mmCIF file of C-alpha atoms in Angstrom:
data_model
loop_
_atom_site.group_PDB
_atom_site.id
_atom_site.type_symbol
_atom_site.label_atom_id
_atom_site.label_comp_id
_atom_site.label_asym_id
_atom_site.label_seq_id
_atom_site.Cartn_x
_atom_site.Cartn_y
_atom_site.Cartn_z
ATOM 1 C CA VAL A 217 -30.677 155.932 63.718
ATOM 2 C CA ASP A 218 -26.929 156.405 63.774
ATOM 3 C CA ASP A 219 -24.533 157.915 61.273
ATOM 4 C CA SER A 220 -21.746 155.535 61.943
ATOM 5 C CA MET A 221 -22.162 152.067 60.284
ATOM 6 C CA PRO A 222 -19.792 149.987 58.048
ATOM 7 C CA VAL A 223 -20.190 151.265 54.513
ATOM 8 C CA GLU A 224 -18.006 149.965 51.584
ATOM 9 C CA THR A 225 -17.469 151.233 48.045
ATOM 10 C CA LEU A 226 -16.827 149.434 44.702
ATOM 11 C CA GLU A 227 -15.715 151.072 41.429
ATOM 12 C CA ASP A 228 -17.933 153.493 39.642
ATOM 13 C CA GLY A 229 -18.860 155.209 42.808
ATOM 14 C CA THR A 230 -21.335 152.562 43.901
ATOM 15 C CA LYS A 231 -22.252 152.064 47.579
ATOM 16 C CA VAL A 232 -23.147 149.307 49.618
ATOM 17 C CA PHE A 233 -24.954 149.597 53.124
ATOM 18 C CA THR A 234 -24.961 147.069 55.892
ATOM 19 C CA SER A 235 -27.734 147.734 58.518
ATOM 20 C CA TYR A 236 -27.653 145.132 61.127
ATOM 21 C CA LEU A 237 -31.074 143.884 61.954
ATOM 22 C CA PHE A 238 -30.808 142.537 65.683
ATOM 23 C CA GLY A 239 -34.039 143.057 67.495
ATOM 24 C CA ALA A 240 -32.445 140.794 69.961
ATOM 25 C CA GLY A 241 -32.645 142.288 73.535
ATOM 26 C CA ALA A 242 -30.073 141.192 74.112
ATOM 27 C CA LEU A 243 -26.379 139.675 74.316
ATOM 28 C CA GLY A 244 -24.367 140.474 77.483
ATOM 29 C CA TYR A 245 -21.339 142.190 78.924
ATOM 30 C CA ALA A 246 -20.012 143.162 82.428
ATOM 31 C CA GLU A 247 -17.778 145.753 83.720
ATOM 32 C CA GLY A 248 -15.110 143.981 85.877
ATOM 33 C CA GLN A 249 -12.126 145.509 87.777
ATOM 34 C CA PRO A 250 -8.401 146.083 87.431
ATOM 35 C CA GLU A 251 -6.357 147.568 90.446
ATOM 36 C CA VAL A 252 -5.220 150.962 90.370
ATOM 37 C CA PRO A 253 -8.407 152.051 88.079
ATOM 38 C CA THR A 254 -7.184 155.605 88.395
ATOM 39 C CA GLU A 255 -3.953 157.499 89.065
ATOM 40 C CA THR A 256 -2.182 160.743 88.867
ATOM 41 C CA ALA A 257 1.471 161.607 88.460
ATOM 42 C CA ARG A 258 3.559 164.872 87.663
ATOM 43 C CA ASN A 259 7.000 165.624 86.517
ATOM 44 C CA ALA A 260 8.716 168.059 89.025
ATOM 45 C CA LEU A 261 11.556 169.387 87.079
ATOM 46 C CA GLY A 262 8.939 170.253 84.508
ATOM 47 C CA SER A 263 5.384 171.032 85.094
ATOM 48 C CA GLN A 264 2.876 168.518 84.115
ATOM 49 C CA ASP A 265 0.009 166.462 85.367
ATOM 50 C CA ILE A 266 -1.562 163.285 84.022
ATOM 51 C CA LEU A 267 -4.644 161.055 84.081
ATOM 52 C CA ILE A 268 -4.957 157.269 83.264
ATOM 53 C CA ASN A 269 -7.991 155.158 83.114
ATOM 54 C CA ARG A 270 -7.317 151.470 81.926
ATOM 55 C CA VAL B 217 27.490 121.401 110.013
ATOM 56 C CA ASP B 218 26.932 123.235 106.862
ATOM 57 C CA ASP B 219 26.581 122.158 103.121
ATOM 58 C CA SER B 220 28.222 125.266 101.802
ATOM 59 C CA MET B 221 32.081 125.436 102.145
ATOM 60 C CA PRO B 222 34.843 126.228 99.648
ATOM 61 C CA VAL B 223 35.403 123.134 97.722
ATOM 62 C CA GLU B 224 37.894 123.036 94.877
ATOM 63 C CA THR B 225 38.631 120.658 92.255
ATOM 64 C CA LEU B 226 41.655 119.082 90.548
ATOM 65 C CA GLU B 227 41.656 116.705 87.518
ATOM 66 C CA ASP B 228 41.558 112.964 88.239
ATOM 67 C CA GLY B 229 38.363 113.745 90.240
ATOM 68 C CA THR B 230 40.106 114.412 93.454
ATOM 69 C CA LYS B 231 37.976 116.626 95.739
ATOM 70 C CA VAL B 232 39.477 118.997 98.326
ATOM 71 C CA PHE B 233 37.936 120.401 101.579
ATOM 72 C CA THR B 234 38.758 123.464 103.752
ATOM 73 C CA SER B 235 36.830 123.301 107.119
ATOM 74 C CA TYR B 236 38.017 126.436 109.031
ATOM 75 C CA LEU B 237 38.770 125.772 112.689
ATOM 76 C CA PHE B 238 38.134 129.121 114.442
ATOM 77 C CA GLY B 239 36.772 128.775 117.961
ATOM 78 C CA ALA B 240 37.335 132.328 118.135
ATOM 79 C CA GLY B 241 34.248 134.288 119.385
ATOM 80 C CA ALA B 242 35.305 136.251 117.393
ATOM 81 C CA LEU B 243 36.044 138.552 114.618
ATOM 82 C CA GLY B 244 34.111 141.770 114.505
ATOM 83 C CA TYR B 245 31.598 143.893 112.648
ATOM 84 C CA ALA B 246 29.275 146.890 113.155
ATOM 85 C CA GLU B 247 25.860 147.551 111.685
ATOM 86 C CA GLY B 248 26.035 151.182 110.544
ATOM 87 C CA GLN B 249 23.089 153.217 108.858
ATOM 88 C CA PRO B 250 22.223 154.694 105.796
ATOM 89 C CA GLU B 251 19.572 157.313 105.201
ATOM 90 C CA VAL B 252 16.672 156.112 103.305
ATOM 91 C CA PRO B 253 16.811 152.543 104.406
ATOM 92 C CA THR B 254 13.731 151.376 102.677
ATOM 93 C CA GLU B 255 11.624 153.251 99.947
ATOM 94 C CA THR B 256 8.860 152.468 97.320
ATOM 95 C CA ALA B 257 8.341 154.055 93.957
ATOM 96 C CA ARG B 258 6.391 153.417 90.858
ATOM 97 C CA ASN B 259 6.171 154.216 87.117
ATOM 98 C CA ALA B 260 3.047 155.980 86.021
ATOM 99 C CA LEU B 261 2.464 155.588 82.333
ATOM 100 C CA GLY B 262 3.555 152.106 82.870
ATOM 101 C CA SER B 263 2.401 149.766 85.448
ATOM 102 C CA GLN B 264 5.224 148.877 87.812
ATOM 103 C CA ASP B 265 6.335 149.071 91.431
ATOM 104 C CA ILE B 266 9.610 148.484 93.221
ATOM 105 C CA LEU B 267 11.451 148.016 96.331
ATOM 106 C CA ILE B 268 14.858 148.739 97.515
ATOM 107 C CA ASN B 269 17.180 148.070 100.553
ATOM 108 C CA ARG B 270 20.642 149.591 100.450
#
């Protein structure tokens, strides 16, 4: 059960629901890597600090 | 022997050569020093890195 799925609308306020039926278990994905996966910088004449992810 | 020497060009496809004759040993020069002879920085929000010499 999830609240976020594609839902469309036609005129006269009628709705259409999608509801994928997968039951697969599964497809696949992998994480991989960049370089510099995380970093921090700052602005000295001001006062700030940052984060990055990428 | 060197390939790079001043070579001028006139019309009529007539080349002209220079060929310094020195046998000096020598003229002179001195090294000198800056401060910050070498440095490395980077942009944060973007992905870059740099080198400098000066």
